[PDB]
Design a protein around this ligand. Structure first.
Ligand SMILES: [Mg+2]
Ligand SMILES: [Mg+2]
Ligand SMILES: [Mg+2]
Ligand SMILES: [Mg+2]
Ligand SMILES: [Mg+2]
Ligand SMILES: [Mg+2]
Ligand SMILES: [Mg+2]
Ligand SMILES: [Mg+2]
Ligand SMILES: [Mg+2]
Ligand SMILES: [Mg+2]
Ligand SMILES: [Mg+2]
Ligand SMILES: [Mg+2]
Ligand SMILES: [Mg+2]
Ligand SMILES: [Mg+2]
Ligand SMILES: [Mg+2]
Ligand SMILES: [Mg+2]
Ligand SMILES: [Mg+2]
Ligand SMILES: [Mg+2]
Ligand SMILES: [Mg+2]
Ligand SMILES: [Mg+2]
Ligand SMILES: [Mg+2]
Ligand SMILES: [Mg+2]
Ligand SMILES: [Mg+2]
Ligand SMILES: [Mg+2]
Ligand SMILES: [Mg+2]
Ligand SMILES: [Mg+2]
Ligand SMILES: [Mg+2]
Ligand SMILES: [Mg+2]
Ligand SMILES: [Mg+2]
Ligand SMILES: [Mg+2]
Ligand SMILES: [Mg+2]
Ligand SMILES: [Mg+2]
Ligand SMILES: [Mg+2]
Ligand SMILES: [Mg+2]
Ligand SMILES: [Mg+2]
Ligand SMILES: [Mg+2]
Ligand SMILES: [Mg+2]
Ligand SMILES: [Mg+2]
Lengths: 116, 101, 70, 87
RNA sequence: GUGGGAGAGGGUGGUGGAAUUCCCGGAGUAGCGGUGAAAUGCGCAGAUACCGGGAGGAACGCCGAUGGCGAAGGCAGCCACCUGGUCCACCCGUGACGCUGAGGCGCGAAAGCGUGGGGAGCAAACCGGAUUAGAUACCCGGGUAGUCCACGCCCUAAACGAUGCGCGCUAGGUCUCUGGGUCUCCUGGGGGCCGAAGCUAACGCGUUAAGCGCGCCGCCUGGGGAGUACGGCCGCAAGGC
């Protein structure tokens, strides 16, 4: 109902899940998916297979709004982070470029005990 | 009196009425703190490396002065008061250290 | 690979206002290059790092950038 | 701080003769001036502890020289102390 | 003394971006999160993920080092003011003015205490979920004191180089920080590594001595009982010598 036909895609990859949002060139999202949106429930969400299926679900939802050209943004390290990217180039959507924007602090906040 | 260098960056949207006023204000602020001006360099519109005050550009100024040292921190306090003024960095002058000479 | 000092001129290591030369010492990101890549000396790199940080506050050098690859 | 202008003014005042830079009177005259610069800096800045250590060494050095002048020529000692307002 | 030099040395004020949390709006559906698997939790009052705007506190990525400074504790954004120590070149001045140091005084990470602020993230106690034979724990979700600031106490430590300080003497090689020099190098002052002689029970040390000497202070005399009891001093308390 929008006919955007060009926009951005954000891959948020963690060790517990990989989720994909698709937005217009201004950042406002169109659709999205994740490892939990598809059938997977538990630890299977942070797997490269789930990361692939989640990427492909969003890419087919964006076809309904008419998306052809996509710019990709990647945040976080985790299993299936690369598998989502590879799933996106072959999704039919011509991938314009790929950027890594993973936020790193300048050593500002104290991490949880796990991360120290 | 030591010798310093003044970096002033202000909003790159001012017309000449506001540009003359803002600068003759900077003149008035240096007279009241006792800064003998040695030379001036005005760059103007310059592309910034990141947004400052939501604005992608900045209008740059540079003065080399000689003034009493005790009054420096108060001089910086007087220049930042103006809304149009954005960056005020004052650095004590140094010798031009050459590398690969 | 070549080093930065190896391919450059006679420049002022203390000038924070010359962005054209200081851009050569930042990486693809806004990060400061290691000594192994800049080809500077102990005293030189310490001076460069300080004039870089100054240019960063003047909005002339970036604090951080975005990598286009991967 | 202490510029060489103010520095020369004190040495020419307490020199036993033209050209003397290292007399005991000159050192104590020099030490006593840096004492007053620091004690006024430590009236404010009461939390500057690492500068307070240098002041202890300057006083001990000043007393060490005064204890020396005392033994050799006790007259110039009284002439020095009355001229600096110490003890 | 003069002239130079380097530095997260200290104190004060100011200041910059990244990120976290929270608020506001835009956009947008069904879960996010988390683990060896999970569950409490959060989510239709619209979360997570994305864009813009605002607030607040704390800590400084790359530079960054096997590095530098400091007497030790300890000291990392940037700028300015006040400021301490130290090193080299000149061989100018004073003329043994030196070394150590029982007491005394001052400093002293973290935690803890008092008064008043502040409170984003983390997080004793505690509240839950798991695990387990049991879980008063490791793992997960929350969370108060506290961590931050001001002023005043507290005086402990693996406060470690488990090596008190100062000086002289005794092969070198190599890496390095910083000065000066007639700048393949020489010469100082720090920081590492191999190793002569020699020492050591051995591991190891070896011009930064644990070598050869000298001066002064501290301290030791089997383990448990025990840094306990008593006494004293200090402390608001905890507790310290
Ligand atoms: Mg999971
Ligand atoms: Mg302003
Ligand atoms: Mg400092
Ligand atoms: Mg400081
Ligand atoms: Mg909202
Ligand atoms: Mg519920
Ligand atoms: Mg609910
Ligand atoms: Mg509910
Ligand atoms: Mg608040
Ligand atoms: Mg590092
Ligand atoms: Mg040292
Ligand atoms: Mg100094
Ligand atoms: Mg002589
Ligand atoms: Mg003589
Ligand atoms: Mg001593
Ligand atoms: Mg004592
Ligand atoms: Mg303490
Ligand atoms: Mg504490
Ligand atoms: Mg308290
Ligand atoms: Mg927590
Ligand atoms: Mg917890
Ligand atoms: Mg068991
Ligand atoms: Mg149970
Ligand atoms: Mg809370
Ligand atoms: Mg001994
Ligand atoms: Mg040289
Ligand atoms: Mg050496
Ligand atoms: Mg042997
Ligand atoms: Mg050895
Ligand atoms: Mg020795
Ligand atoms: Mg022995
Ligand atoms: Mg004893
Ligand atoms: Mg016994
Ligand atoms: Mg005890
Ligand atoms: Mg008794
Ligand atoms: Mg008792
Ligand atoms: Mg009592
Ligand atoms: Mg005890």
């Amino acid at each position: 109902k929008r006919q955007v036909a060009s926009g951005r895609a954000y891959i948020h990859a963690s060790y517990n899940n990989t989720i994909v949002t698709i937005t217009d060139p201004d950042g406002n999202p169109i659709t999205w998916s994740s490892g939990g949106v598809i059938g997977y429930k538990g630890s299977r969400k942070g797997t490269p297979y789930a990361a692939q299926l989640a990427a492909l679900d969003a890419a087919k939802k964006a076809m309904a709004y008419g998306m052809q050209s996509v710019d990709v943004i990647v945040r976080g390290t985790g299993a299936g982070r690369e598998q989502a990217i590879r799933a996106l180039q072959a999704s039919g959507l011509q991938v314009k470029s790929i950027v890594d924007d993973t936020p790193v602090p300048h050593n500002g906040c104290r991490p949880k005990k796990k991360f120290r | 009196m030591r010798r310093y260098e003044v970096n002033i960056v202000l909003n790159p949207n001012l017309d000449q009425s506001q540009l003359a006023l803002e600068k003759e204000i900077i003149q008035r602020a240096l007279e009241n703190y006792g800064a003998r001006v040695e030379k001036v360099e005005e760059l103007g519109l310059r592309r910034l490396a990141y947004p400052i005050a939501k604005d992608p550009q900045g209008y740059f100024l540079w003065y080399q002065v000689e003034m009493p040292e005790d009054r420096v921190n108060d001089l910086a306090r007087e220049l930042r008061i103006r809304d149009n003024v954005r960056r005020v960095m004052v650095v004590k002058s140094q010798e031009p250290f050459l590398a690969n000479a | 690979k070549a080093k930065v000092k190896a391919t450059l001129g006679e420049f002022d290591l203390r000038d924070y206002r010359n962005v054209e030369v200081l851009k050569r010492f930042l990486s693809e990101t806004g990060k400061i290059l290691p000594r192994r890549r800049t080809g500077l000396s102990a005293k030189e790199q310490r001076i460069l790092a300080k004039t870089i940080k100054r240019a960063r506050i003047l909005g002339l050098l970036p604090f951080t950038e975005k990598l286009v690859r991967k | 701080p202490i510029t060489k202008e103010e520095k020369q003014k004190v040495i020419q005042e307490f020199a036993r003769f033209p050209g003397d830079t290292g007399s005991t009177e000159v050192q104590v005259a020099l030490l006593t001036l840096r004492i007053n610069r620091l004690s006024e800096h430590l009236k404010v800045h009461k939390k500057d502890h690492h500068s307070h250590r240098g002041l202890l060494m300057m006083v001990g050095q000043r007393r060490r020289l005064l204890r020396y002048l005392q033994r050799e020529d006790p007259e110039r000692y009284r002439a020095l102390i009355e001229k600096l307002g110490i003890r």
